[PDB]
From Swiss-Prot:
The two PARP-type zinc-fingers (also named Zn1 and Zn2) specifically recognize DNA strand breaks: PARP-type zinc-finger 1 binds PARP-type zinc-finger 2 from a separate parp1 molecule to form a dimeric module that specifically recognizes DNA strand breaks. The PADR1-type (also named Zn3) zinc-finger mediates an interdomain contact and is required for the ability of parp1 to regulate chromatin structure. GO terms for biological process: ATP generation from poly-ADP-D-ribose; DNA ADP-ribosylation; double-strand break repair; innate immune response; negative regulation of innate immune response; negative regulation of transcription by RNA polymerase II; positive regulation of double-strand break repair via homologous recombination; positive regulation of single strand break repair. Poly-ADP-ribosylated on serine, glutamate and aspartate residues by autocatalysis. Auto-ADP-ribosylation on serine takes place following interaction with HPF1. Auto poly-ADP-ribosylation on serine residues promotes its dissociation from chromatin. This is Poly [ADP-ribose] polymerase 1. Poly-ADP-ribosyltransferase that mediates poly-ADP-ribosylation of proteins and plays a key role in DNA repair. Mediates glutamate, aspartate, serine, histidine or tyrosine ADP-ribosylation of proteins: the ADP-D-ribosyl group of NAD(+) is transferred to the acceptor carboxyl group of target residues and further ADP-ribosyl groups are transferred to the 2'-position of the terminal adenosine moiety, building up a polymer with an average chain length of 20-30 units. Serine ADP-ribosylation of proteins constitutes the primary form of ADP-ribosylation of proteins in response to DNA damage. Belongs to the ARTD/PARP family.
């Protein structure tokens, strides 16, 4: 049997659940009959990004309608969709194209999960759970619910739940201390930076086997820079509320997973509006979208030298901003070191 603690077993089963992978795909409107989980390949996804990049360019620059039609046909042939009894929409709307770029970001992690699942599982001297856990190459440990470490993190969850997102409550079910293989080493150079904070990162449960094995990553070269508000970086938040929304939970499926990573921000390039950033100004290490609400800078604490903005949501002085909450973006995969993974229970007001 499994040597792992029970919570870790339940966590592994959850991140490797095949049924959830299909639900994700059906939600993106993929045709599961023409495109089964086993047909997904990295190459296939790369090409789809490119097609999206080209069509994005034709819409922006007023390319021929014939061009947009041809690109839409090629995309739907590469990734079969099921629109039911309705006609398939063309990739001629920048918002629909953005939705599709996001679907591909998710398919990239689902593909990693399924590949690992069907990998080397022949060993009979190990429990299936134990075998899959090892495939993550991430040391996972249960954080003691009554320790200081856990107290601080629960304070961070409770105090930073935004006002406009109170359509649900959040209960911390379990906290795991995680350490991905070799991540501490690629992150070493950044301990020399100042302004290192403990920030949030939410994602679907179907993305977690990919996140744990590959770590968080920036979209590939093929993806249009336009598919993302502040360019192709890695996004984080200081309000548990903003990140929780990216968990994509519901009343029917209330358990979400969320990350706490140490991110080396250094000198932030503060922006109040979108900017499809490519190059970063000299002397800047990250981007910070300014929001109307942020944790009370008064209550900020430290946890092993890292700033934890656990203060209550207070209104910042800035008004000429499009954002409601702050967003933090780093453009280097080595600028983040994952620390904790929390199992959250979304209680929806009914
Ligand atoms: C866009 C954005 C801002 C802040 C946090 C997140 C995101 C999307 C990815 N996951 C997040 O938690």
């Amino acid at each position: 049997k499994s040597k792992l603690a029970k919570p870790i077993q339940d966590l592994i089963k959850m991140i490797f659940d095949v049924e959830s992978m299909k639900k994700a795909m059906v939600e993106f409107e993929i045709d599961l009959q023409k495109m089964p989980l086993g047909k997904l390949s990295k190459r296939q996804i790369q090409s789809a990004y490119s097609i999206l990049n080209e069509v994005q360019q034709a819409v922006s620059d007023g390319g021929s309608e014939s061009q947009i039609l041809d690109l839409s046909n090629r995309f739907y042939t590469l990734i079969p969709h099921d629109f039911g009894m309705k006609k398939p929409p063309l990739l001629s709307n920048l918002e629909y194209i953005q939705a599709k770029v996001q679907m591909l970001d998710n398919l990239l992690d689902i593909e990693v999960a399924y590949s690992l699942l069907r990998g080397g599982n022949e060993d009979g001297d190990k429990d299936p759970i134990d075998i899959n856990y090892e495939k993550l190459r991430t040391d996972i440990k249960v954080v003691d619910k009554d320790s200081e470490e856990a107290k601080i993190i629960k304070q961070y969850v409770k105090n930073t739940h935004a006002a406009t997102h109170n359509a649900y409550d959040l209960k911390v079910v379990e906290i795991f201390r995680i350490e991905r293989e070799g991540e501490s080493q690629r992150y070493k150079p950044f301990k020399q930076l100042h302004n290192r904070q403990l920030l949030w990162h939410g994602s679907r449960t179907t993305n977690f086997a990919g996140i744990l094995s590959q770590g968080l990553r920036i979209a590939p070269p093929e993806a249009p820079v336009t598919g993302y508000m502040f360019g192709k970086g890695i996004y984080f938040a200081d309000m548990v509320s903003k990140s929780a929304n990216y968990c994509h939970t519901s009343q029917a499926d209330p358990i979400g997973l969320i990350l706490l990573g140490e991110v080396a921000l250094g000198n932030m390039y503060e922006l109040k509006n979108a900017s499809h950033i490519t190059k970063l100004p000299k002397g800047k290490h990250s981007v910070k979208g300014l929001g109307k609400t942020a944790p009370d800078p008064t209550a900020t604490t430290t946890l092993d030298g890292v700033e934890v903005p656990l203060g209550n949501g207070i209104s910042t002085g800035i008004n000429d901003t499009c954002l409601l909450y702050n967003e933090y973006i780093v453009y280097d995969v080595a600028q983040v070191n994952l620390k904790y993974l929390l199992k959250l229970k979304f209680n929806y007001k009914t």
